[PDB]
């Protein structure tokens, strides 16, 4: 029939059952109206997750235990035109897919972060050198002295 995904703020999102069994956690929760709390997810992020499941009802995803079909799968055109959002709300979508155990949203929604870590400019790797500490200042001086000769 229909289930209710109660968000972390308090709203109620009526989702179709076959669509909302994309989430492994809810599909295991249904084995007892069936409401269920999703505590750490805002209403907009859960709306984005439900729109993802509404599109990818009919699609077919890899077997969650792959080396080739899971790492080397390209993102969909909708999934790349779907995650052009704020970066913090992107990580909150990934947190929502890691709570609800939605593995293909944690697949296609997290290869985008992989495409953003690589493919970045080598100037702002030199700029982001010790934004987290990770080195003593003696070793920072030695590292900056080793490649002082080029620039």
């Amino acid at each position: 029939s229909n289930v209710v995904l109660v968000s972390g703020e308090g709203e109620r999102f009526t989702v179709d059952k076959k669509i909302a069994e994309r989430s492994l956690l809810l599909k295991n929760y249904l084995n007892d109206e069936i409401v269920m709390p999703v505590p750490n997810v805002r209403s907009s992020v859960l709306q984005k997750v439900i729109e993802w499941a509404e599109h990818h009802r009919d699609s077919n995803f890899p077997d969650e235990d792959d080396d080739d079909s899971r790492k080397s799968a390209p993102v969909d055109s909708w999934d790349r035109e779907f995650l052009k959002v704020d970066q913090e709300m992107l990580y909150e979508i990934i947190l929502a897919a890691n709570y609800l155990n939605i593995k293909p949203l944690l697949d296609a929604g997290c290869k985008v972060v992989a495409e953003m870590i690589r493919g970045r400019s080598p100037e702002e790797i030199r700029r982001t050198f010790n934004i987290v500490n990770d080195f003593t200042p003696e070793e920072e001086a030695a590292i900056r002295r080793e490649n002082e000769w080029a620039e």
């Binding site: 956690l25 295991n28 929760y29 084995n31 505590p39 750490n40 890691n98 709570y99």
Partner: protein, 527 residues
Amino acid sequence: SSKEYLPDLLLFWQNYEYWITNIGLYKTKQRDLTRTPANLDTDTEECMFWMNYLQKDQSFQLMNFAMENLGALYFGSIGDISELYLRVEQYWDRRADKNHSVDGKYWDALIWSVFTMCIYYMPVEKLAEIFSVYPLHEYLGSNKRLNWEDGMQLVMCQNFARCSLFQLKQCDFMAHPDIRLVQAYLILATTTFPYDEPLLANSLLTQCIHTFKNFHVDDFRPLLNDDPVESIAKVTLGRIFYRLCGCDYLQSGPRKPIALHTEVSSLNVDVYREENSTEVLYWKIISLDRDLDQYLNKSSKPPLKTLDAIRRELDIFQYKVDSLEEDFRSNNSRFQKFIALFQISTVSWKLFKMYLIYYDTADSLLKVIHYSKVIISLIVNNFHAKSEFFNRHPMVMQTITRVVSFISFYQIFVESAAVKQLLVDLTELTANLPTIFGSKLDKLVYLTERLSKLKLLWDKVQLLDSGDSFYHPVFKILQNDIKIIELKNDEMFSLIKGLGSLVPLNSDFRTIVEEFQSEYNISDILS
């Protein structure tokens, strides 16, 4: 600017859980030997009454209740019960004889263990329609108005278990090992017999391991050159073996050294993944629990690859238990569904508890709260009609002990708003569990009450920092509970009292600690 002691206090919970809620509460029987009686005139006139109290039609009503409502428990051990009606017939035929063969007395002990399981899993409304209250009170000499739901069904369950043991001891079962001993113990292990006598159950389990490994059967796959009777014999032996490993892991501890379970379900080993998943699914979900509860007493973190592997097998067994047959016209299918779903909820809770303690991953506290609500939603759902007795299986006592002890431990140190409502819900659930658990339910309520009073002591005394490590009376009380129960689970003192004439010889916070240990002692949970 937060609470920094908390990781090395949850790492202490991983030791406190084992030395209180696992070993100290269920598997500790502090017995003196200069006070315990020993006779064969007390029990030989008591078990004679408990074997004369049952009649023929009452026993067949118990067997009908087993055939209709308990097929998830005996069918691994004894097979289908339609072969066992003949054994109840032969027991009531051979009742008046005076020369009993051992091959008759083993079937008598097996069907009295089946009767013990039937008494333990029967609702009080169906029990009052079968038996009678008043001859039992005219014999035992107690409070007369002490009806079955007020703590009397446990007494008849324990005495039927003791009569099944007395009929085993008439077999000279040490001198004649046979598979009916293993079957009778695997029927008795579905009751609270492994917790009313935690030192007798370990020795009977050692005798069942000796009885099983007497056969020297390691491969339960029927070979090509086997007798077609011997093939079905080895199939039934394999079902008995995995039921025996399931009821063998649950009694692990310091008072049970000889273990049968030697295999691994993830990642030498001997005997696994050769057997068809029919009711080894109950074993596979417990080895997946053994891979989590082997890090309680151990002092090293489980690797995260192991926890991810356990999470993947949890999802696989979720989809496997949802792949089971929907035989709603037999009431035992819902009970098998409840067992194989409550086990996977228990292992899920323990998995995300160990994620919360050892690594603090993504929303693991919310996953602990979620699977605690799933355990509550599985137990509260059984409070309807026709399935009220599902909450009597000992795994719900074990699991509710672990869950309410962890939530009461976590309410002390972390001021949260969902954990508080969850703790109120589990307190309401623990005060609504079935009363056939007996003294263990009252000791669980006492342990939850002690942790709540320890929470009230946490807010009272201000925390004393020292830079490198902290100091508080609550910390020292929790340190001392493990030391007291390790002192109680050390049989060296009974050894010094046993070898002969040997005699055993060996501020602001201490006052509060000794007053709290005098008012709320931890030795109350042993008995």
